[PDB]
Structure 1
Amino acid sequence: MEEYYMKLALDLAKQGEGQTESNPLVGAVVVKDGQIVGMGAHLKYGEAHAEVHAIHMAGAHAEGADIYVTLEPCSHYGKTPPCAELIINSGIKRVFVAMRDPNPLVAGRGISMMKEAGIEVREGILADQAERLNEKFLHFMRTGLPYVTLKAAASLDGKIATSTGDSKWITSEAARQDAQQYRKTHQSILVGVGTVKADNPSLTCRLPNVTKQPVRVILDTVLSIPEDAKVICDQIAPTWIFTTARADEEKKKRLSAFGVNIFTLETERIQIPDVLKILAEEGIMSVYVEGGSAVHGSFVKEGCFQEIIFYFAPKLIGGTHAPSLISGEGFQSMKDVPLLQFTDITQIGRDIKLTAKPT
């Protein structure tokens, strides 16, 4: 029964998937005398939290009742009493948090606030699942870095283009559509100029209710990206480019007026850990790296990736000097190559979709 009520809280929480933007999905269940009297979930960014809806729905049955919450109740004494306090004043006797605040700084303030009020607080009930709920979000608060997803579509022999650099549709139609989805679940999309220049890619999640365009990030060491690129122009979604001192001053103040946020790095070459640091500062909590063989390589030798997604089409491109899946410096020795782990294998159309994760 304990875990039951918590499972429900989870299921409610999930209903708000893709509706909170940069807020954590959350659910809550108010049980009273062995009867569910209140249920709730964070449904829309900036609107009522999950503990609120539930409490309200439970009304007078809140007092002397329990309340299962997926994540630790809000505890800032901001512009309104916090959900941690709102739980207090409602007369709830026992609270069942699943997992604590992601922010090392706040973690516990909620549990404390309540516990010192006489509320019995139990933690960890199904916290194993109350973890999967918001991977990307929890990663960000725990590591201050965005959640990186590396994606690519390649031939069966790991070539993302032919000798000519021609990528005239390696993967099928169904593949694109699928891959598109990720452009909606990530705060940003990232590519290296080597792609940009040779594709003028839009990089705009063209899915259902977009209600928020992802930041388009380009990596350019000497800032050579042409001004006739849909990312430079078409002011659809934001466009940030990272570069070194090597960029032209005028071109920089130019495109900077066009809305393009140019970030300059004081290093010889652009260092991935540095751009993921910047981004986490500009509030981005996730990046969808899908650009260039070289960019995918720097991301690998660095270890800056949480997820790997490759689309493999029934076709052999071949060619020794044809761009391969991952480039970069690589790993000279096999004993130094880290061990990933296949997460999921699913066939999209005639193509195959392999997905893996670290350790």
Structure 2
Amino acid sequence: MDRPFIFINSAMSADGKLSTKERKQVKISGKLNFERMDELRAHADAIMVGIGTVLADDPSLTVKSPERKAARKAAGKSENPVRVVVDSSARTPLNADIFKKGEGLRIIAVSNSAPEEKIRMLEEKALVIKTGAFRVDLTELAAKLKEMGINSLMVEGGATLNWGMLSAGLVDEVYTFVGNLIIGGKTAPTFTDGEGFTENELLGLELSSAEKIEDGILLKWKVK
């Protein structure tokens, strides 16, 4: 029933895009936003992304700063928080950078439809948690993560995973770094894609703060 505190942290263009229409990564934020993001990763118990992000960008999801890594190690944690990939069909690449870089637990959340041959390969490098039929049951995942010690879960995104989490009612707060650019594109991934809310189910927020950082602005929203 219970779950971690859950927050989304992403960087988007002034027009709401996470990457181009080609699904390519571009420069949205500068060094100061990257330092803020590294502070969040250091204090989070776990970081989560979707399979889409893993296949597109192959991110390591590591804490970068030696001092943050040491501070975590000093308090008895792994240098990196737990790293979780949401991945229905067990397609996380075996040579993904998440497995190559750094210490810490990796968790692949898969669906019960996932092929067992792919799951066994993945289990060599990670804990595999199975939920749902053809897609991951994010509520059940969130309960299992909470059970195993995670009280703080940072969702860094994916346009579709952000939708999954917000529409399941699992999210406490939304952090959006808004960068000084227009990306454009009907098919460019946005801060929240997926199915979308109809007019009678819009998710209300409350603006907690707005802080200029370098050339953009960090908006923090509490979810209602």
Task: Tell me the TM-score normalised to structure 1 length.
Answer: 0.57
The counterpart of 1:321, out of the listed 167, 184, 187, is 187
Tell whether the 8 Å contact from 1:175 to 1:351 is kept in structure 2 after alignment. Answer: no
The reply on whether 1:342 has 2:207 as its aligned counterpart is yes
Who is 1:180 aligned against?
38
1:159 corresponds to 2:17? yes
The runs of 5 or more residues in structure 2 that have no matched partner are none
Which moves more between the two structures, 153-162 or 228-237? 228-237
Aligned twin of 1:210 = 72
Whether the 8 Å contact between 1:342 and 1:356 is mirrored in structure 2 is yes
95, 103, 110: which is aligned to 1:243?
110
Task: Determine helix, strand or coil for the equivalent of 1:298.
Answer: helix
**Deviation string, structure 1 residues 184-243 (Cα, Å, up to 9, x no partner):** 121000000100112111111223223122100000110111111121233522100111
State the structure with more CA Rg: 1
Partners of 1:156 and 1:162 lie apart in 2 by 13
Judging by fraction of residues, say which structure has more strand: 2
Cα deviations across residues 247-275 of structure 1 (Å, max 9, x unaligned)?
Answer: 332332222123x0011114221121111
**Secondary structure class of the residue paired with 1:336:** coil
C-alpha contact (below 8 Å) 1:204/1:237 kept by paired residues? no
Give the Cα–Cα distance (whole angstroms) in 1 for the partners of residues 204 and 111 of structure 2. 33
* Matched residue type, 1:166: K
String of CA shifts for 1:328-357, please: whole Å, max 9, x gaps: 222111x42132111111011111100010
The letter of the residue matching 1:277 is A
Gaps of 5+ in 1: 1-142
Partner of 2:162: 296
TM superposition outliers: structure 1 runs of 4+ over 3 Å? none
1:47-66 deviation digits (Å, cap 9, x = unpaired): xxxxxxxxxxxxxxxxxxxx
Q: Indicate if the aligned counterparts of 1:223 and 1:246 stay in contact, CA closer than 8 A.
A: no
Map of 1:268 onto structure 2:
134
TM-score, reference length from structure 2: 0.90
Q: Distance in 1 between matches of 2:132 and 2:187?
A: 32
Aligned-residue CA RMSD in angstroms?
1.5
2:96 aligned with 1:234, yes or no? Answer: no
Question: Counterpart of 1:150 in 2: which secondary structure?
Answer: strand
In 2, Cα distance between equivalents of 1:346 and 1:235: 32
Q: Which segment drifts farther, 287-296 or 235-244?
A: 235-244
Summarize the alignment of residues 12-23 of structure 1 with structure 2, pairs less than 5 Å apart: none
For residues 206 and 162 of structure 2, the distance between their equivalents in structure 1, rounded to whole angstroms, comes to 18
CA contact (8 A) 1:192 1:219 kept: yes
CA–CA separation in structure 2 for the residues paired with 1:344 and 1:267: 39
Q: CA deviation at 1:312?
A: 0.4
Cα contact 2:30–2:214 (8 A) shared by 1: yes
1:355 aligns with 2:223: no
Question: What is the alpha-carbon distance in structure 2 between the residues aligned to residue 230 and residue 320 of structure 1?
Answer: 30
CA–CA separation in structure 1 for the residues paired with 2:58 and 2:22: 17
Query: Number of matched residues?
Result: 215
User: What is the distance in 2 between the residues matched to 1:265 and 1:322?
Assistant: 29
Q: Does 1:194 pair with 2:52?
A: yes
Residue pair 2:24, 2:56 contacting (<8 A) in 1 also = no
The structure showing larger relative contact order (alpha-carbon pairs under 8 Å, at least 6 residues apart) is 2
Matches within 5 A, 1:94-109: none
